[PDB]
Ligand binder design. Structure first.
Ligand code: FES
Ligand SMILES: [Cl-]
Ligand SMILES: [Cl-]
Ligand SMILES: [Cl-]
Ligand SMILES: [Cl-]
Ligand SMILES: [Cl-]
Ligand SMILES: [Cl-]
Ligand SMILES: [Cl-]
Ligand code: NI
Length: 324
């Protein structure tokens, strides 16, 4: 389960690049500097849709919900984040500049170096690469475990850009979901994984002059924490942060995540109704004045953005990441 092939990737209107049997069309494109649209990079949001003009591809997730029942059954529309090339390809997609990697993405061999209890639910995993850890606050990595070849999943970085090559992620204590590269044989010090990134365009925006509100459900606390840290570093203003954990009062040691608890206004929502009703109650009609960042389970993120827009928050002050 080790050899891979390389093929030509022609994107109509762009320079002929390369693609392969070893990575998705998304990352090959992005790796080539092309702004192929994407958000989730994991088969759910539908944003990376392209039309297969010619050539043959293989899907990592045939049931991927980002592709509608219609599209899965009729025509030549596929998802770039889920598809590998099995020959030279010609595709058509609306390329945009805002998706060009801020920082050149790469395939990195990374070793687990530290694991520690974040919360009753969250486990923090710190890995090291031979290369500097270079990423913006709010970006993610796609993570693979050689045990499971076709099992790429997305995880927001929790720490910050450092020259020591450290990448931290928050993962679930209970192995739920379904398939994950975080087998328990891989949550031990010395395990080797593969990080692709940095990915994502929902990173922190400086110079807004607005206050930050970070909303993180479940493992989305990684993203929420990286934005909160970066806001405090920027302005020293108070950052309001809301998060969901199922057990009452499971505090996170904010000094271990390099965050000053002063300049930090934390409200936990114990996992009736949920997190976006706790935010709406607490802040009322003041939300439109904040720069808002969310992460979490797709249903939670979608409900919250609906609440936000319904409460008059400009679309361009809302930033999010939801992975499937
Ligand atoms: S980016 Fe491919 S479905 Fe979300
Ligand atoms: Cl990939
Ligand atoms: Cl697909
Ligand atoms: Cl790459
Ligand atoms: Cl997990
Ligand atoms: Cl949640
Ligand atoms: Cl989550
Ligand atoms: Cl930072
Ligand atoms: Ni082969």
């Amino acid at each position: 389960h080790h050899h891979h092939h390389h093929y030509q990737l022609k994107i109509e209107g762009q320079a002929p690049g390369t693609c392969g049997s070893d990575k998705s069309l998304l990352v090959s494109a992005l790796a080539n500097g092309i702004g192929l649209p994407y958000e989730c990079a994991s088969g759910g949001c539908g944003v990376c849709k392209f039309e297969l003009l010619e050539g043959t591809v293989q899907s990592m997730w045939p049931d991927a919900p980002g592709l509608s029942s219609r599209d899965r059954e009729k025509g030549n529309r596929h998802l770039a984040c889920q598809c590998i090339a099995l020959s030279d390809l010609r595709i058509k997609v609306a390329v945009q500049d805002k998706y060009i990697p801020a920082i050149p993405i790469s395939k990195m061999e990374a070793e687990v170096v530290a694991v520690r209890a974040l919360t009753h639910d969250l486990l923090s995993v710190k890995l090291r690469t031979d290369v500097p850890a270079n990423f913006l606050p709010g970006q993610f990595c796609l993570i693979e475990a050689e045990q499971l070849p076709g099992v790429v999943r997305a995880y927001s970085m929790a720490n910050s850009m450092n020259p020591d090559g450290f990448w931290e992620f928050y993962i679930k204590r209970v192995p739920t979901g379904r398939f994950s590269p975080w087998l328990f044989e891989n949550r031990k010090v010395g395990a080797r994984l593969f990080l692709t990134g940095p990915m994502g365009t929902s990173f922190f925006r400086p110079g807004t002059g607005r206050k930050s509100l970070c909303i993180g459900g479940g493992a989305g606390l990684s993203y929420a924490a990286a934005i909160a840290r970066a806001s405090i570093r920027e302005t020293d203003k108070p950052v309001k942060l809301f998060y969901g954990s199922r057990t009452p009062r499971d505090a996170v040691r904010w000094i271990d995540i390099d965050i000053d608890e002063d300049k930090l206004e934390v409200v936990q929502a114990v996992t009736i109704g949920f997190i976006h009703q706790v935010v709406d109650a607490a802040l009322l009609e003041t939300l439109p004045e904040y720069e808002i960042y969310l992460a979490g389970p797709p249903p939670m993120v979608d409900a919250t953005v609906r609440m936000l827009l319904g409460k008059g928050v400009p679309r361009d002050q809302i930033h999010f990441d939801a992975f499937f």
